[PDB]
Amino acid sequence: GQLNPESADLRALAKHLYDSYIKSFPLTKAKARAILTGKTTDKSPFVIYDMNSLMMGEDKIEVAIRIFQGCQFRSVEAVQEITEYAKSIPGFVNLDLNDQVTLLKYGVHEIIYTMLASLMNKDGVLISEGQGFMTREFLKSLRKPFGDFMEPKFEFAVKFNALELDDSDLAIFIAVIILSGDRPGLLNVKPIEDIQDNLLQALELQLKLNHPESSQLFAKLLQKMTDLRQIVTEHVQLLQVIKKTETDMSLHPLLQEIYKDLY
């Protein structure tokens, strides 16, 4: 590596994306980690870890289809923020509009799961705008099919969070996800790969500068896209599990509202 005009341009791109990311996403990874590690004394979340504490937290808060309808509605803001971020990626708004929509309609789910990992640690997930913390084992204990909804996302998040990415890293990673030339139905793949090539160069440099501890972090991070893609693909099978579940699927109303905060 040398400090030359192209490397400076890649640093300017990384900065541009970081600044846009801060402007687009009010809830950053740093803010979420500060809550999770016990430093946002302004907002100490209530811990929901069993049915008893679930009822004690009442003031702070088909069934499964209604959950999905509700979490999709609550994710509209995230979709809008991700779309606003995408407009800042140099070259993106010059693409064929159909390709912009295609890139976003596939990319937003992978990006939402990436951002969900910031809200998670091995014990649980922030909910209710950081005012609450829902434990992983309590979610896992819930009757089928609900108890299986979130555990694969926790498994992913622990592995993903072990990379110790910060918001500057994530800004470039999210842009790389958006500019994926492999999305089905794309009309003009080459201009998308031209931008992604630039973003990948910027990510590779960002990770080398920012993570001296982690020699193949670029490759490990790109491999995390396989897990993101698996989780997204599986959501179609959650829908089939629900159709075929002959059992009772009632769920405490407050648990229904907590699930609407998830994805």
């Binding site: 979709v79 809008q80 606003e84 407009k87 708004v93 509009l97 929509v101 976003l104 309609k105 937003v108």
Partner: peptide, 14 residues
Amino acid sequence: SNLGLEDIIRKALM
């Protein structure tokens, strides 16, 4: 939904 999601994205790109 997919059609609902596409419409959200299209409006947001406006």
